[PDB]
Amino acid sequence: STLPDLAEQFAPPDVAPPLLIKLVEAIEKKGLECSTLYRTQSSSNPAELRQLLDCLDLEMFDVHVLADAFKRYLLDLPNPVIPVAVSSELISLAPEVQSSEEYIQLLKKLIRSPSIPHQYWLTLQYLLKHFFKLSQTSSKNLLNARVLSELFSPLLFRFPSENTEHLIKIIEILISTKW
Amino acid sequence: STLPDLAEQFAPPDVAPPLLIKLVEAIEKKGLECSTLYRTQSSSNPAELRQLLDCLDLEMFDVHVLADAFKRYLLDLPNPVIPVAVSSELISLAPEVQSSEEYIQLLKKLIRSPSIPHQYWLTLQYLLKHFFKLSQTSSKNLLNARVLSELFSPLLFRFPAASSENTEHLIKIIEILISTK
């Protein structure tokens, strides 16, 4: 797993990692209406998926393989899209705080911190955009904000339990549109 | 004060921040043989030098202003070229580690850590290349590797520490890495 840090894959004024852009655009072109996108295990193992993530047109690949490589990408990032410091703070507030809008405002504040490269917020924004576009064809792909949140929150925060429930809902709301 | 983090100013495959490249290339074009480069102050204050670090061709400026803007840039980076995490560990090393080669090995390992974006090490390498290029015209600019280390180590590490055998070691490694490029 040689995948560089998000901050090493691109920098402003670019808006997202170029590899993540290729994956998202190919997946959206080929699987926007696939009733099982992101919920089916393809036949490829991590080593094969990583070969795809190390270099040519991703549209040539099976859409279920692209979906698995997307997940592999989020898993292999040296640091998760939502850094551990941010997740740790949100989780330790879990019993004391229960306002979703407060969690959302705090997540935004924490992830835009000066100590955290801007690329993390930018990538999160790009992923939320992708997840939201999928939810607009939910009647066909069955991926609504809630399902998308349950699938990807563990990859974005990098957790496998009851504390997590607050994090999942945050993503669900942010997918559906919010601050 | 508004200078973005090194990790936000560029990313691979670029090798250094574009602004730093402009400064270095202009300084090398106009001052490679200047015998007081980096050793005299220009008349501009920090606010004016920061003004320059936004926006034109930098070759248009007085070379002594460019040299001061170069220093201003290193000082205004939100985190120094050599992050404090690295400096703290290096300064903490015991006297039994008397080997410059060991300090260098640890600097590379610590600064290449996944917790530190590759841009910091890349920027340091670009600066060392510049410092090495200067030391090769020492017969005219009077700049050797050691003096360049003594001048710029406080800007690269940005570390208030009392002079010790640890501080001497960090200056020494920078000296070695300049002459080794």
Residue numbers in the entry:
A (entry chain B): 113 to 167, 172 to 276, 280 to 298
B (entry chain A): 113 to 167, 172 to 297
The authors write:
The N-terminal domains of p85α include an SH3 domain, capable of binding to proline-rich sequences, and a BH (breakpoint cluster region homology) domain. The BH domain can bind to and regulate several GTPases including Rab5, Rac1 and Cdc42. In addition, the p85α BH domain, either alone or together with the SH3 domain, can bind to and positively regulate PTEN activity.
In contrast, several of the p85α mutants (E137K, K288Q, E297K) showed near wild type binding to PTEN, and either had enhanced (K288Q) or reduced (E297K, E137K) ability to stimulate PTEN lipid phosphatase activity. These mutation sites are located in regions of the p85α BH domain, well away from the Rab5 binding pocket. No significant differences in protein flexibility were observed for any of the mutant proteins, suggesting that the mutations did not alter the rigidity of the domain.
